[PDB]
Design a binder for this molecule. Sequence first.
Ligand code: OGA
Ligand code: MG
Ligand code: NI
Ligand code: ZN
Length: 331
Amino acid sequence: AQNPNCNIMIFHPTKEEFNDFDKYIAYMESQGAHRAGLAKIIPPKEWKARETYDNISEILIATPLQQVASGRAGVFTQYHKKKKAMTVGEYRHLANSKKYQTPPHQNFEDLERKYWKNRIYNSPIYGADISGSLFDENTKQWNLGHLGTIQDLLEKECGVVIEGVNTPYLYFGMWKTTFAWHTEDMDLYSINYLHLGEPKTWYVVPPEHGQRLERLARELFPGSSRGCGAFLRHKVALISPTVLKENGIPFNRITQEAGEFMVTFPYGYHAGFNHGFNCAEAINFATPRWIDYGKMASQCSCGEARVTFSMDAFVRILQPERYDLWKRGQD
Ligand SMILES: O=C(O)CNC(=O)C(=O)O
Ligand SMILES: [Mg+2]
Ligand code: NI
Ligand SMILES: [Zn+2]
């Protein structure tokens, strides 16, 4: 069995290997990359996402979200307070302001220490989940706006035609902006490209151990757990690496830099934070190996999680027994 310790692997495809996306994901899994829950893909040196980022300031962040924490430094929740719209240019200025800028630090490890010590005492502002793409239309390889759709995959594998579309999202981050412990909708894969700016640190639990994380989460967030049997789907809970280690939860960590892709694999719980002003693009996708995960994905039916139009058909076809209760949660 490849990669039995579930380490995060880093891949360096050649330009030729970068042509066929599906093939390369299949290659990565042949070498055991999925066991980690997360992989890093460094594009060939010949490749570019687009010519420059000089013209992005007029993009609008319609609903910036201020991320307010409650709890203790290593175990906390966050809620998203809606703020007034601003442009990417206005947002970058805010990120670079004294109130929000990255502090002086020695290296990534120092900055990680400062993040876990001090995150709860600030409320950074995140531009998340903005429908759109920064890939040039002429970029033919690993263009996140031109991937095969999840609906087509399900069609190809299972023969059923379904409604729905699948498009990318832009994330504009600053220091301390945070992504809570989660798996993807329907335990899908995700792919994330860091277009520009400061790094993003990731933490990930191997899919084969995700239930160990869930059991700890229920212990650490007991009221949340009583309200919903899948409350990690709410995407509000944070647990530090120090707390994971104290409770024996297997996990790994890696920092993503500008120009790099990260792939998250089905049922790979992940969480993380941004180092300073950045812009990432991400999209869910599927492979044939996903189908089994999709059939077994937990669902939030308490009403909090509230998700895209396109998840209806996934639940309807893969999880018909759950469908009625889950849709009541949606409505
Ligand atoms: O970048 C972020 O804030 C969150 N991204 C993801 O969780 C992902 O790509 O799966
Ligand atoms: Mg612009
Ligand atoms: Ni994710
Ligand atoms: Zn719920």
